[PDB]
Amino acid sequence: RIHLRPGSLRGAAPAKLHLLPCDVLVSRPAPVDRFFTPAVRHDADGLQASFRGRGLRGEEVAVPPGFAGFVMVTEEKGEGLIGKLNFSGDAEDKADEAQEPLERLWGLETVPG
Amino acid sequence: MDLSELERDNTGRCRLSSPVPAVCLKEPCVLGVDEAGRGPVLGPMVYAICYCPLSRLADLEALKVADTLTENERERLFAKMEEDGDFVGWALDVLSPNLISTSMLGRVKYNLNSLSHDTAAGLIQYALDQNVNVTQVFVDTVGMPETYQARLQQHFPGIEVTVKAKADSLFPVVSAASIFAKVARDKAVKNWQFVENLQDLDSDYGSGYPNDPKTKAWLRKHVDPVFGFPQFVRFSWSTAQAILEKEAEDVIWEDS
Amino acid sequence: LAARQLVFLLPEHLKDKKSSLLFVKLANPHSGEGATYLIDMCLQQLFEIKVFKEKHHSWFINQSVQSGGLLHFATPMDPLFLLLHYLLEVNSKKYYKYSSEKTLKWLEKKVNQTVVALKANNVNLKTGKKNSKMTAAQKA
């Protein structure tokens, strides 16, 4: 029984979303622009970057055609907290191209909660 | 300026080298390789090569290198070898704390020893490519020289490669390279401290070696809950990982 | 200690009288029972929210980290129209016409409507019928 008026998901501000190949086990603020960002480099393939001393290779990934990305803070009333059309998809030692469940049991299931 | 002094770790590493002295393109030369920074959990590791005409070895043995000394005396002798750049050439590779971390912490394993040797292979490769008339190559090591020499002689099948466990006191060109490498590692850590200090950050870390409790304590006081350490820290060090497991959020990798 | 963050993919148009959108759990067909659904109170256009979650992913979202790696999709509810979508007891209007009870040529036509849909992409009756989840819970 959760409501979100279209004014939230309208004008809501742009967000940077990275998706890491590693699970940081507690949600929490984090100094991304101090530690991660300045590590990101560009090259002929996607991107390099470090995390915990492990080498990461990235690709930009576009939100499906006809769609739009939203960060919803589950608490209060749905409520779009930011917006995105694209996110960096980081992977380990390798770009991680072709397909893994990301760019595709397709992975993914039902929701409850 | 730092605009570019960021990407000393875009490539992850750095080769500095001298113009190759004319004599050393035609006369036979000896080539010493050695290193600094295998140990610290902090800073770059440095590999160096030195070379010079066989005819001019006397200027190293008989003169003043081979002859355990201080950070001061070391700085001077290297200015003498820099001075007579008429017949001694050199180059080093400065591998950064982070290339080191990322090499050893890849999904597919690559150790300190490999990483080091490769670098030593690469540096010797460079000097051939520069048309240095190299005939022998002495390489310093720690422990059993044999299988170090086995793989190094396989590669480079056209030059003699001697691998000695205390080569920096045996052959003068290995002794010199030892000093270039120690001097580069030191200039490389001072630069770091200057920049740390410049921005009112704490650069008081001790010896750099794990096991020296000042260094262990600096690491302790410097552990961001999500990201862990500053680039300065060899994340891949047994000691590094241990501290992070105690003082920073648990993260599961794709190593399922 | 940190307001959980959901990362959602939504149809473009939702950003277009009063408060409009509603989240609600309902009887998931195929036995399911227990599934979230988004309803556009400007009359239906039912939406099925399925989540992407594989082991060992997490999100950096702005100056922060979220632990899931979860990626929620809202997709028009049902047919072949929503087979490009995640490719990467209340309702009203068009209900009569949306009926036309369980026909083998409902299946035949849908499992073909989705064959033409999986015909433009390399795998290996029309729009989001808000009825695929109105038959499993009405007929049985």
From Swiss-Prot, chain A:
Record has Cell cycle as a keyword: no
Subcellular location: Nucleus
S-S pairs: none
This protein's UniProt keywords: Acetylation, Nucleus
Biological processes per GO annotation: mismatch repair; RNA catabolic process
Any one GO cellular component localisation term in the record: ribonuclease H2 complex
Family to which this protein belongs: Belongs to the RNase H2 subunit C family.
Oligomer status and interactors: The RNase H2 complex is a heterotrimer composed of the catalytic subunit RNASEH2A and the non-catalytic subunits RNASEH2B and RNASEH2C.
The protein's role, per its UniProt record: Non catalytic subunit of RNase H2, an endonuclease that specifically degrades the RNA of RNA:DNA hybrids. Participates in DNA replication, possibly by mediating the removal of lagging-strand Okazaki fragment RNA primers during DNA replication. Mediates the excision of single ribonucleotides from DNA:RNA duplexes.
Name under which the protein is recorded: Ribonuclease H2 subunit C
Gene name as annotated: Rnaseh2c
First-to-last residue of the parent protein present: 13 to 141 of 166
Curated annotation (Swiss-Prot), chain B:
Chain sites annotated for binding a divalent metal cation: D34, E35, D140
Modified residues (Phosphothreonine): T215
Residues found modified as N-acetylmethionine: M1
Effect of E35A: Loss of enzyme activity
Keywords: Acetylation, Endonuclease, Hydrolase, Metal-binding, Nuclease, Nucleus, Phosphoprotein
Effect of D34N: Loss of enzyme activity
InterPro entries given in the database record: RNase_H2_suA, RNase_HII/HIII, RNase_HII/HIII_dom, RNase_HII_hlx-loop-hlx_cap_dom, RNaseH-like_sf, RNaseH_sf
Protein name: Ribonuclease H2 subunit A
Organism: Mus musculus (Mouse)
Gene this protein is translated from: Rnaseh2a
Curated annotation (Swiss-Prot), chain C:
Compartments (UniProt record): Nucleus
CDD domains: RNase_H2-B
InterPro entries per UniProt: RNase_H2_suB, RNase_H2_suB_wHTH, Rnh202_N
Gene3D superfamilies the record matches: 1.10.20.120, 2.20.25.530
Pfam families (UniProt xref): RNase_H2-Ydr279, Ydr279_N
Function text: Non catalytic subunit of RNase H2, an endonuclease that specifically degrades the RNA of RNA:DNA hybrids. Participates in DNA replication, possibly by mediating the removal of lagging-strand Okazaki fragment RNA primers during DNA replication. Mediates the excision of single ribonucleotides from DNA:RNA duplexes.
Assigned protein family: Belongs to the RNase H2 subunit B family.
Binding partners and assembly: The RNase H2 complex is a heterotrimer composed of the catalytic subunit RNASEH2A and the non-catalytic subunits RNASEH2B and RNASEH2C.
Protein known as: Ribonuclease H2 subunit B
Gene giving rise to this polypeptide: Rnaseh2b
